[PDB]
Write a protein that binds this ligand. Structure first.
Ligand SMILES: O=P(O)(O)CP(=O)(O)O[C@@H]1[C@@H](OP(=O)(O)O)[C@H](OP(=O)(O)CP(=O)(O)O)[C@H](OP(=O)(O)O)[C@H](OP(=O)(O)O)[C@H]1OP(=O)(O)O
Ligand SMILES: [Mg+2]
Length: 163
């Protein structure tokens, strides 16, 4: 709906979410996408006009999409969805190549959460799957999902990478 908030600069959709970790920090909670039911992503969603901070949105989305409750233990900062929207799709340099200039689709504000509880019933528990994954499994899931920005957020978290 038109509750959604956008960057006044880039027009990017403002989204907040959580990298939800086990207390031992060996695993991260992932959910299946609403649009692409095969892809494993992390809980996140559009900030709404009434929400006073990104943490509110992140914990609301973590509950709604993953039935996950916990405490925010770190600000993981921002990442951008840099996915393009058929004239000149690339702007090559002399020792490198890039996709043609465009604004970000989405500006993501991520928090690290320590999981305190996982509930069986939650708003989207019939529309999504949710599962804990080690770093290596999570990394592969977010590459498979084509979401390097979500992996960047995971890499900033305290998740144990030495598997
Ligand atoms: O209807 P349109 O084609 O104009 C937009 P689309 O539905 O394809 O966008 C969805 C979005 O659904 P919507 O905002 O409720 O319409 C999802 O929103 P939901 O999770 O269904 C509801 P939310 O906005 O999170 O409260 C989630 O967007 P996001 O808000 O989680 O970033 C998806 O992202 P993802 O599941 O692929 O990661 C994102 O798909 P994407 O644009 O990434 O292909
Ligand atoms: Mg979402």
């Amino acid at each position: 709906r038109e509750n959604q908030v956008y960057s006044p600069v880039t027009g990017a959709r403002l989204v907040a979410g959580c990298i939800c970790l086990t207390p031992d920090k060996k695993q991260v909670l992932m959910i299946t996408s609403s649009a692409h039911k095969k892809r494993w992503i992390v809980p996140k969603g559009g900030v709404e006009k009434d929400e006073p901070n990104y943490e509110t949105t992140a914990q609301r989305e973590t509950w709604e999409e993953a039935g996950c409750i916990g405490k925010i233990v770190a600000n993981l900062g921002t990442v951008e969805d840099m996915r393009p929207p058929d004239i000149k799709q690339f702007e090559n340099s002399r020792k490198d190549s890039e996709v043609a200039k465009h604004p970000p689709r989405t500006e993501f504000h991520f928090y690290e959460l320590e999981i305190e509880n996982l509930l069986d019933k939650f708003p989207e528990c019939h529309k999504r799957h949710r599962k804990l994954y080690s770093y290596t499994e999570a990394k592969q899931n977010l590459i498979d999902a084509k979401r390097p920005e979500l992996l960047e957020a995971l890499n900033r978290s305290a998740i144990i990478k030495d598997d």
